[PDB]
Amino acid sequence: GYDRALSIFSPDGHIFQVEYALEAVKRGTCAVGVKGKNCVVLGCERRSTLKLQDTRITPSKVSKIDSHVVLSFSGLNADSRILIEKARVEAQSHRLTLEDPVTVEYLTRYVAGVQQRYTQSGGVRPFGVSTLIAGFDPRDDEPKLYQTEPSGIYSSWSAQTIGRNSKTVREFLEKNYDRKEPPATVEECVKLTVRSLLEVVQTGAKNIEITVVKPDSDIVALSSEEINQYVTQIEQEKQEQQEQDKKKKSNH
Amino acid sequence: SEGTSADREIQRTLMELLTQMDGFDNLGQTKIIMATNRPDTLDPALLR
Amino acid sequence: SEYDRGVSTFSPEGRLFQVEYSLEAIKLGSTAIGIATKEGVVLGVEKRATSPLLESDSIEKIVEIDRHIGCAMSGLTADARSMIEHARTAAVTHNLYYDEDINVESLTQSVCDLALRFGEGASGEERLMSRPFGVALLIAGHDADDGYQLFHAEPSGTFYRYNAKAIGSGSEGAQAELLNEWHSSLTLKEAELLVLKILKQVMEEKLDENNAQLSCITKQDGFKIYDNEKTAELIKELKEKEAAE
Amino acid sequence: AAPYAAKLKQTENDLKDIEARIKEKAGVKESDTGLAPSHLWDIMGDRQRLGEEH
Amino acid sequence: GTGKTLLARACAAQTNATFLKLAAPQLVQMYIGEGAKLVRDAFALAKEKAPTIIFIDELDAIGTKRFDSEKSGDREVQRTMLELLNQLDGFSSDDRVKVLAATNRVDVLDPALLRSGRLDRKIEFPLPSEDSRAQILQIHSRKMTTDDDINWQELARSTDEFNGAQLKAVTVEAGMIALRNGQSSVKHEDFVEGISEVQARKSKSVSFYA
Amino acid sequence: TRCKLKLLRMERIKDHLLLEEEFVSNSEILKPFEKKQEEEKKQLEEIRGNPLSIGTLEEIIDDDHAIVTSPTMPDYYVSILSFVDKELLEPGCSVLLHHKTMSIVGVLQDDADPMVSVMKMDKSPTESYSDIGGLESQIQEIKESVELPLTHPELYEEMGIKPPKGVILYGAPGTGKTLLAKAVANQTSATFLRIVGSELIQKYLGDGPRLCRQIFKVAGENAPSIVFIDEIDAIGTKRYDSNSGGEREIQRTMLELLNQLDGFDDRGDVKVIMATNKIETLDPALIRPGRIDRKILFENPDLSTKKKILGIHTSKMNLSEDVNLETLVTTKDDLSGADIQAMCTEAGLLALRERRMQVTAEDFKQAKERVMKNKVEENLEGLYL
Amino acid sequence: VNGSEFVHKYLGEGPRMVRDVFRLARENAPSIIFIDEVDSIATKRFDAQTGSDREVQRILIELLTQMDGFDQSTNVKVIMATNRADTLDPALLRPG
Amino acid sequence: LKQIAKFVVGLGERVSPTDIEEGMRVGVDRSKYNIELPLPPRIDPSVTMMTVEEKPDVTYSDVGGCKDQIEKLREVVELPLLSPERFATLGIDPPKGILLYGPPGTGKTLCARAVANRTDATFIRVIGSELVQKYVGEGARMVRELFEMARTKKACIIFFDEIDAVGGARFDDGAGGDNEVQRTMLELITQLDGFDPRGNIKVMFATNRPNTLDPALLRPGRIDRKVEFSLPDLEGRANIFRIHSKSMSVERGIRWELISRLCPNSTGAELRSVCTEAGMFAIRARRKVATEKDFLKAVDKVISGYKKFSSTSRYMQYN
Amino acid sequence: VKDLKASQRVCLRSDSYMLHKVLENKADPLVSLMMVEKVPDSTYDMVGGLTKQIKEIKEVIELPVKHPELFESLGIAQPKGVILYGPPGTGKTLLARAVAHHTDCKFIRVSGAELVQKYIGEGSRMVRELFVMAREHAPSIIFMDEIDSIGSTRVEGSGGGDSEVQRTMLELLNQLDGFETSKNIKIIMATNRLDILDPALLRPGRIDRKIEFPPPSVAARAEILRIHSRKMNLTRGINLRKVAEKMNGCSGADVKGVCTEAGMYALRERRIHVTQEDFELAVGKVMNKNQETAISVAKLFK
Numbered sequence A: 001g002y003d004r005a006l007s008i009f010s011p012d013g014h015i016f017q018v019e020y021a022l023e024a025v026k027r028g029t030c031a032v033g034v035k036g037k038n039c040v041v042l043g044c045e046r047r048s049t050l051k052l053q054d055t056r057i058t059p060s061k062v063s064k065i066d067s068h069v070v071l072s073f074s075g076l077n078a079d080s081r082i083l084i085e086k087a088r089v090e091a092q093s094h095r096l097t098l099e100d101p102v103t104v105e106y107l108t109r110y111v112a113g114v115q116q117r118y119t120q121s122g123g124v125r126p127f128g129v130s131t132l133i134a135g136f137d138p139r140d141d142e143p144k145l146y147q148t149e150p151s152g153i154y155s156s157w158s159a160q161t162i163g164r165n166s167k168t169v170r171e172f173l174e175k176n177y178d179r180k181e182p183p184a185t186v187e188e189c190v191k192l193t194v195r196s197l198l199e200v201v202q203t204g205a206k207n208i209e210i211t212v213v214k215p216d217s218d219i220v221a222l223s224s225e226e227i228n229q230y231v232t233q234i235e236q237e238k239q240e241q242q243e244q245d246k247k248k249k250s251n252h
Numbered sequence B: 001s002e003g004t005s006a007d008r009e010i011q012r013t014l015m016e017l018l019t020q021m022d023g024f025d026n027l028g029q030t031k032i033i034m035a036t037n038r039p040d041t042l043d044p045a046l047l048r
Numbered sequence C: 001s002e003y004d005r006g007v008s009t010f011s012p013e014g015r016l017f018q019v020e021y022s023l024e025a026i027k028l029g030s031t032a033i034g035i036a037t038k039e040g041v042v043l044g045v046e047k048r049a050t051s052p053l054l055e056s057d058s059i060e061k062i063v064e065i066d067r068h069i070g071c072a073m074s075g076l077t078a079d080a081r082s083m084i085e086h087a088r089t090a091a092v093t094h095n096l097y098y099d100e101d102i103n104v105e106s107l108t109q110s111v112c113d114l115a116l117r118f119g120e121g122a123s124g125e126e127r128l129m130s131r132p133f134g135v136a137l138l139i140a141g142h143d144a145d146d147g148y149q150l151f152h153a154e155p156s157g158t159f160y161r162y163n164a165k166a167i168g169s170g171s172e173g174a175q176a177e178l179l180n181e182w183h184s185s186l187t188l189k190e191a192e193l194l195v196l197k198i199l200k201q202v203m204e205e206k207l208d209e210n211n212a213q214l215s216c217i218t219k220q221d222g223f224k225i226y227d228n229e230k231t232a233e234l235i236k237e238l239k240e241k242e243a244a245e
Numbered sequence D: 001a002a003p004y005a006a007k008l009k010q011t012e013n014d015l016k017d018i019e020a021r022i023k024e025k026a027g028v029k030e031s032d033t034g035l036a037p038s039h040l041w042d043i044m045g046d047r048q049r050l051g052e053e054h
Numbered sequence E: 001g002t003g004k005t006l007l008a009r010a011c012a013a014q015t016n017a018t019f020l021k022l023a024a025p026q027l028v029q030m031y032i033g034e035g036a037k038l039v040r041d042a043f044a045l046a047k048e049k050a051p052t053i054i055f056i057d058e059l060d061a062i063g064t065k066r067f068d069s070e071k072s073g074d075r076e077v078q079r080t081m082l083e084l085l086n087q088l089d090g091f092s093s094d095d096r097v098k099v100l101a102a103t104n105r106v107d108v109l110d111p112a113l114l115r116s117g118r119l120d121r122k123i124e125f126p127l128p129s130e131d132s133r134a135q136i137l138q139i140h141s142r143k144m145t146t147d148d149d150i151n152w153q154e155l156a157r158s159t160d161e162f163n164g165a166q167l168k169a170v171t172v173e174a175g176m177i178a179l180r181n182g183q184s185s186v187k188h189e190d191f192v193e194g195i196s197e198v199q200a201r202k203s204k205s206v207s208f209y210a
Numbered sequence F: 001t002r003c004k005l006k007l008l009r010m011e012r013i014k015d016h017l018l019l020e021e022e023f024v025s026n027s028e029i030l031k032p033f034e035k036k037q038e039e040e041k042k043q044l045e046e047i048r049g050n051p052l053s054i055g056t057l058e059e060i061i062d063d064d065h066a067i068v069t070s071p072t073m074p075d076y077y078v079s080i081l082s083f084v085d086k087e088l089l090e091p092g093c094s095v096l097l098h099h100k101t102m103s104i105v106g107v108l109q110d111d112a113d114p115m116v117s118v119m120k121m122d123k124s125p126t127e128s129y130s131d132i133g134g135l136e137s138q139i140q141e142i143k144e145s146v147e148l149p150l151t152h153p154e155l156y157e158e159m160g161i162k163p164p165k166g167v168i169l170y171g172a173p174g175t176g177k178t179l180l181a182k183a184v185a186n187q188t189s190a191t192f193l194r195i196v197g198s199e200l201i202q203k204y205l206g207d208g209p210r211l212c213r214q215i216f217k218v219a220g221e222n223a224p225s226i227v228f229i230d231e232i233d234a235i236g237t238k239r240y241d242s243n244s245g246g247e248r249e250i251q252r253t254m255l256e257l258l259n260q261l262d263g264f265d266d267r268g269d270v271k272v273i274m275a276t277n278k279i280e281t282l283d284p285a286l287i288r289p290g291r292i293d294r295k296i297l298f299e300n301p302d303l304s305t306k307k308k309i310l311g312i313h314t315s316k317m318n319l320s321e322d323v324n325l326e327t328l329v330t331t332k333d334d335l336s337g338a339d340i341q342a343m344c345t346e347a348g349l350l351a352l353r354e355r356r357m358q359v360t361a362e363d364f365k366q367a368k369e370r371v372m373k374n375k376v377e378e379n380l381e382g383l384y385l
Numbered sequence G: 001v002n003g004s005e006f007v008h009k010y011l012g013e014g015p016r017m018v019r020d021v022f023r024l025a026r027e028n029a030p031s032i033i034f035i036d037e038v039d040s041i042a043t044k045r046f047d048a049q050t051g052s053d054r055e056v057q058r059i060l061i062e063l064l065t066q067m068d069g070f071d072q073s074t075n076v077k078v079i080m081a082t083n084r085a086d087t088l089d090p091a092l093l094r095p096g
Numbered sequence H: 001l002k003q004i005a006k007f008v009v010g011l012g013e014r015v016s017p018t019d020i021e022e023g024m025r026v027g028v029d030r031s032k033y034n035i036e037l038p039l040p041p042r043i044d045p046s047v048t049m050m051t052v053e054e055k056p057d058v059t060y061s062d063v064g065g066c067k068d069q070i071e072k073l074r075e076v077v078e079l080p081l082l083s084p085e086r087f088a089t090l091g092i093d094p095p096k097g098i099l100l101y102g103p104p105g106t107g108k109t110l111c112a113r114a115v116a117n118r119t120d121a122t123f124i125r126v127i128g129s130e131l132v133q134k135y136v137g138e139g140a141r142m143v144r145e146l147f148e149m150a151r152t153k154k155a156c157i158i159f160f161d162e163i164d165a166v167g168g169a170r171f172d173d174g175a176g177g178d179n180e181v182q183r184t185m186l187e188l189i190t191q192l193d194g195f196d197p198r199g200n201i202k203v204m205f206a207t208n209r210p211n212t213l214d215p216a217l218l219r220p221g222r223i224d225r226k227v228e229f230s231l232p233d234l235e236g237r238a239n240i241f242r243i244h245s246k247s248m249s250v251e252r253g254i255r256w257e258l259i260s261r262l263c264p265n266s267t268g269a270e271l272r273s274v275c276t277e278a279g280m281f282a283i284r285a286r287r288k289v290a291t292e293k294d295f296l297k298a299v300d301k302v303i304s305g306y307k308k309f310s311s312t313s314r315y316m317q318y319n
Numbered sequence I: 001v002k003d004l005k006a007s008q009r010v011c012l013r014s015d016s017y018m019l020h021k022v023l024e025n026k027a028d029p030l031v032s033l034m035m036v037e038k039v040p041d042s043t044y045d046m047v048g049g050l051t052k053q054i055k056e057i058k059e060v061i062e063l064p065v066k067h068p069e070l071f072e073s074l075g076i077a078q079p080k081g082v083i084l085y086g087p088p089g090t091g092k093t094l095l096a097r098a099v100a101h102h103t104d105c106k107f108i109r110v111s112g113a114e115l116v117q118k119y120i121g122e123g124s125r126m127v128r129e130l131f132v133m134a135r136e137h138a139p140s141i142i143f144m145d146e147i148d149s150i151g152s153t154r155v156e157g158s159g160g161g162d163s164e165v166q167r168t169m170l171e172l173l174n175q176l177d178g179f180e181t182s183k184n185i186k187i188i189m190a191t192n193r194l195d196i197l198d199p200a201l202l203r204p205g206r207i208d209r210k211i212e213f214p215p216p217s218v219a220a221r222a223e224i225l226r227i228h229s230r231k232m233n234l235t236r237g238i239n240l241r242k243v244a245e246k247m248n249g250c251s252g253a254d255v256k257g258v259c260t261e262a263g264m265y266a267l268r269e270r271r272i273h274v275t276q277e278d279f280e281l282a283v284g285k286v287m288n289k290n291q292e293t294a295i296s297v298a299k300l301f302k
């Protein structure tokens, strides 16, 4: 049995195609979401092969679904393309009908619905892709981050890690982050995302990509200069940290 | 190469049989007739 | 065994195996309890925090279907998305056609008719769902000519009326207690604290308001989903009640 | 590796000395099976054993 | 469980004859070169004081088709089995000495024993028919308590691919459930519950409509 | 030099001393007795005649006689004679027989077989942690199951629960699960059998399951013991095609192995270590528990683990002067412990070849690329990208 | 010898037969070893995972190592013939 | 002789013609061939003293639960031996055999040990690979001799544990004496058959697969009654944790009810392993009791390990 | 009895079975196996043309036996067993043969299967007997052929009667790695591919050194022609380097195949010299073979 289609329920009550989709997520690139209280930072790992691959004509892992909603992804690179396109045509159809900017909540349900559609029928597999969808609501400054899974279950998470070796980032993120007091300033928010991706990239600040989404439909993608500037400060404080345990131990 | 090994054991006996009737040629006075009773085996007799 | 892969497709006992297997999906899910009382039906649920980064009160396990029909859910929330939508449409078109608040009994049947599509082609209703659903509901409301009813929708398309019914992991244990704890003479404050007494015992973590979410159907208040401040107050009163004893 | 290599060479000599105990130890033994009070039965047993009915 | 053993024993009662029974693991005893004396000894007795039936049961290891499974003494046992058949052919009309044979699978049975008119007439006992099932339950029931509210036709329809062996167990089972409850008189209800405890299925498990 | 000398001084003097005293005393045993212990020796030598045959004791017969089975085909009717009493003998025990007229001498074989010599290990492994490079949690679990109940029963008393009856080790190839088992075997100070699981399998009717049964027989008597049976995918349930001899054999060995391990009151204090490499051929009635009472997954090293394996190995290699350890472990991804063991031996080798009396940076980096070739998968970024 | 006569009568019987045949050639050396059919014995590849298929392979592994020699035999090395040219190619034998 | 050469042998020195007859062991000279002294009857007590054993200390209350299956298993074996009165008056002769099947780790072994203790009659432990003791046809005389010894006693249980060897299945492709493998299987089944009606020679079989079982053997009236055993339902689980935890130190005002909701369907054996493992966590913590928390961990480890072999993953890793 | 040890063969006298003498000779089919094959007289010089292959096998196998000192100080542990791999026909058996001459240790070749011994029955647990007999006669340089060119699928198995030969394969590995004493046991393997290999023969501690023996270069091939001609009669006008460029072989044995064919022409005519023209005709015979194998990949492909 029982993983040979999506239409067998199995006596352990799992639809295998969804369970196996999750293991495909691992193949893609780390992606990390962290909300502040005036920003959401959405950052992802950028894979670098060789110098003969570009990063100009070559697609980033952060994609604009509109002008106030953003998306980063993990999964098969092929799968993700259609997932993003269909989500985008919905985002525009929403202004066509209502004439409103899309609601963050409305959008995430639409993308989870598409994966859910695929998952229910047996004529297709689902998109083997989990995404994190960041954005701000049409007029409120309340920061929103939601997550989707191949299953077509969405949740809201204040911070979440997906992609390659997600769990080891999750535990660090769980500790440092508070929902009692998220970062007040975009600058510390950005650096926390950097701290999370530091672990899994090892060398490079050209393997960390930062984009910020803020209210009033501002999305900006940050420069290699600024990211290198953030990673060096982390690198200096970390160097210092090692020295302090060495002193403190002698001192007591 | 996936048939029974039983038939393979008893194969050898016939190979001594087949070679033996040769001594009679080309005196045609003594002759040999053979009758099969299985389509399961294919005898090295049909071959030579 | 060797008779179980298809949904058509029997089975020396005579049962559809695919249909029975979806029963087992409901136990995977988080515990949900409902208790009908003559003052309203209380739908409490459990939520489970995998990380204390999953924002508890943005996951929805109680949802509004109309102003008088509510649902709680357990099982796959992938299957609950289509399941719920159907019923939200049912209540809204019924009000459109007849102006009357949908009857709870008929609202169940609409859910369960949709549950029935298994095949990929049949005579009669034309089947277009590729598998049985993987979600149960507790359906709660109040109609005007039969009072408060509490139903359980099954993904197998059968409906049992109940006085009280639990689904989820803690279904067996809750069900055992509620056999000793239902009465004709219970009241809605009493129901509310009844759900929490049963709930703490069948939750793996501990009873907090973050991991609880109760709600009521009262004719006066309509469908009211609570807050955590409200839910916390009730928790503090459960603990007082158990202290005396 | 002279400072410590010297001491290594002596360790192999020790291995042979322990081996020589295994041989030595076997050279004298003392054993006995049965119990001491069954000594009278041995005496009987020679008369039956010698004899032929078995 | 088609009732071969039964029918051969009975066959012998009718004709009032000298009945010798042999069974392929019984026949072989001690050193396997002493196995050949025993076949011969048996048939020496039989032909004298005729009529007779020599019935050889379950032949699945001294009448193997393969010659790969090693045997050197149990081979001589097959050969001395063969003399007997030969002397039936040796009488022309072999009225005096009748032989019967039984085996569980005839695919396992040796091909040279069937080959030619060395042994004649091969008789296949199928699964009981609906007709045959009705009769088989009744007879066994006689021995326990018997009630006529039991409709035996109802039972015969329900069972599919059942042997007489399997039905004796249903008759006995009907008695086990009945005693358990403490009803000193069997019902039809008990009997219907006896099909699904002899079979490995559970029909006792509530469903989504039960 | 001073540290070696200090150990060397004590162990040579005493051991050399114990040797010399055995020489003097051995003579000296003999003189006290000459008719006070001598008598039993004279009576045995005469009755035995020196040549003797074995028999197996079939049964006793009441009148001081017995019936025995010889290794030759006839049985014989013996009389019970000599010092050895018939409360020291029961059926199922081996007996010696006298040449001329077969007679019960006594027992001295004590059901010996040449397979007992094979079970019985005499070789002692290295091996303790601090030669085990990481896997802290994995070290811990095998110590609590196998080392601990024997050394400290106190904790098991206090709680009042039975001790683990085994453990099963499984994971990726070459992970060095073998060190941990060896480490358990050294530290305990317990009788360590084993065996390979490919040694119970033969081709001779019914000898195989009796060899399985024999291991437990020797362990239960010399309990507490630990038994390590390697490679259980040589004794799984797997297909066997047709026209094979081994199709029965594999079935019977496994069956006997199963009953003894569970017990019917069990040995009750013999723990087992099973190791294996294919869990898709393992039978289902040997990894359900009461048999084994943990099951543990081993996985290939990661950064912290690698640095430890590496860490021990480099300190036993001279002059790593310009060698940074951290920079190598960083780049390395998804390797076994086998591969890092190999990289130290290879890197030293390149240092020899360079005509250099010391290791370098560049000696290590070259060796590292070589062993990455060997263990590689690329369909992760092949599929993705 | 024949290829109908190089078969497995038992599991692992196939390779036993080869070793006897090439020892015997050495005993009576010089001698010419003739195999009539090596068209069933030699086949480039399989999509199989049974030891039934491995019996056929081990004849060829054995055939190769034995031909070769280590005694540097006074034999006139294996003469073989095949009706086909496309299952016994000069990439299974080869080149000399 | 036990040389298997045959002789006409002279007289003894006190032998009677009324003592030495067919089926009696006698001793003769080893080179002269004359009886002088006769020998005792039989020659099977060598194998039969070890196979029989006295009573283990397990009770039919652990055997876990209080299942319908346990009750019915007691009816087939124990009740008629104890009392045939009910059976004769109902008008049934008791089922002769009974099959113990179910996934391995269901505790058919708990059943074998328990029925021995209750019975107050002789219980023979027999392993299927202690009947294979071949020297070529010797293994068959083991089956025969052992069966015959039970049939001399009247009210007795023979129990075979995990037959699949001797009670195997048939081949048409076998090798090396796979006929003698069949001969030993078939030897058992015929003697069974033959004695019927026996009363009170009762056969139990534990099989880990009922399809590695001869189709001739499986045929009812060797094996008239068959009981299926299963993974205990939630209640049966709850009961069994309390037996084992009575023995351990635990928290007064703990929830065993909670541990069963958490645990999914699983082998009864592995249900026993929970309590042991929970205890392990209390042991390394140095705590002198076992919390509710550490049982939660103990289920989690066993289940999560087991999932590794069969069916992975959940959707409640984010949900 | 001190001059005796358990599992030491001992000779006996008459029918008393009084001990006579001690047998330090132990007669086994393991031994007869090696006895037909003898000590080989292939030398390194004949595999001359590639000396890199000869240089890595020397360092790993020979050098730690003769001088353990270096690797007990500078490195850690005796360098592990090698597996020879490369395209078919390169010279991988030839290399093993050559090494055997130069080391002067006891080899325990051991041909292409081990199921070739059925004098004590089939090796199911007598495979392990090999290690014991080797350990005594130490150094234990072992050579094994499991060429494994056939069966593109064979690694996914876990097995039918694959199991018998796998049980033989497996028990080798356990014994090798051992428990834990060693007497410098080294296993040279020769094999066709490592992609087409016996499952779990390499994993990867065993055997984690690897030696590649590549397809020869023209610079390599010229030397191979040179040495085969020194035994024979040289080319006239010394064009033996000149022909190397015209066709490159694809193996070391293809280089050999030119010379044998070339000197065959001299056999037809019965001349005492060879010439350039003989060498040229000879290359073309070797190419016929590359053509016979693949020809349909140029016509009726994709």
Ligand SMILES: Nc1ncnc2c1ncn2[C@@H]1O[C@H](COP(=O)(O)OP(=O)(O)OP(=O)(O)O)[C@@H](O)[C@H]1O
Pocket: E001, E002, E003, E004, E005, E006, E057, E058, E102, E103, E104, E136, E163, E164, E165, E166, E168, H216, H220, H221
């Ligand atoms: N056709 C039948 N009519 C009456 N009873 C039957 C019949 N078939 C089977 N039985 C009952 O089942 C019991 C067991 O079947 P039985 O031993 O006769 O099988 P068989 O076909 O002769 O066996 P084998 O193939 O093992 O030699 C019989 O003793 C009888 O009580």
Ligand SMILES: Nc1ncnc2c1ncn2[C@@H]1O[C@H](COP(=O)(O)OP(=O)(O)OP(=O)(O)O)[C@@H](O)[C@H]1O
Pocket: F131, F132, F133, F134, F172, F173, F174, F175, F176, F177, F178, F179, F230, F231, F275, F276, F277, F309, F336, F337, F338, F339, F341, I174, I177, I203, I204, I205, I206
């Ligand atoms: N943690 C470690 N510390 C030191 N050496 C290591 C470590 N891990 C691996 N090794 C080295 O690599 C070898 C690889 O393990 P090995 O080949 O014995 O396999 P295994 O998976 O334990 O085998 P099997 O399934 O046959 O029991 C070890 O024996 C040791 O030499």
Ligand SMILES: Nc1ncnc2c1ncn2[C@@H]1O[C@H](COP(=O)(O)OP(=O)(O)OP(=O)(O)O)[C@@H](O)[C@H]1O
Pocket: F258, F262, F285, F289, F290, H062, H063, H064, H065, H103, H104, H105, H106, H107, H108, H109, H110, H162, H206, H207, H208, H240, H268, H269, H270, H272
């Ligand atoms: N129902 C139960 N209650 C209590 N403990 C149990 C129960 N079932 C199993 N166990 C425990 O698990 C151990 C192992 O299971 P056991 O050996 O009894 O199984 P089985 O089904 O007879 O297996 P096999 O197929 O290997 O013969 C028992 O000794 C006992 O400790």
Ligand SMILES: Nc1ncnc2c1ncn2[C@@H]1O[C@H](COP(=O)(O)OP(=O)(O)OP(=O)(O)O)[C@@H](O)[C@H]1O
Pocket: G064, G065, G092, G093, G094, G095, G096, I046, I047, I048, I049, I088, I089, I090, I091, I092, I093, I094, I147, I192, I224, I251, I252, I253, I254, I256
């Ligand atoms: N590199 C070489 N230098 C010189 N002669 C060579 C060289 N390689 C091979 N030879 C010669 O060519 C002969 C044939 O080698 P062949 O190609 O058949 O070898 P192999 O690699 O051992 O094969 P297999 O994989 O079939 O076991 C050798 O026996 C030797 O005489």
Ligand SMILES: [Mg+2]
Pocket: E004, E005, E057, E102
């Ligand atoms: Mg019959």
Ligand SMILES: [Mg+2]
Pocket: F176, F177, F178, F275
């Ligand atoms: Mg190991």
Ligand SMILES: [Mg+2]
Pocket: H108, H109, H161, H206
């Ligand atoms: Mg059992």
Ligand SMILES: [Mg+2]
Pocket: G065, I092, I093, I094, I190
């Ligand atoms: Mg070769």
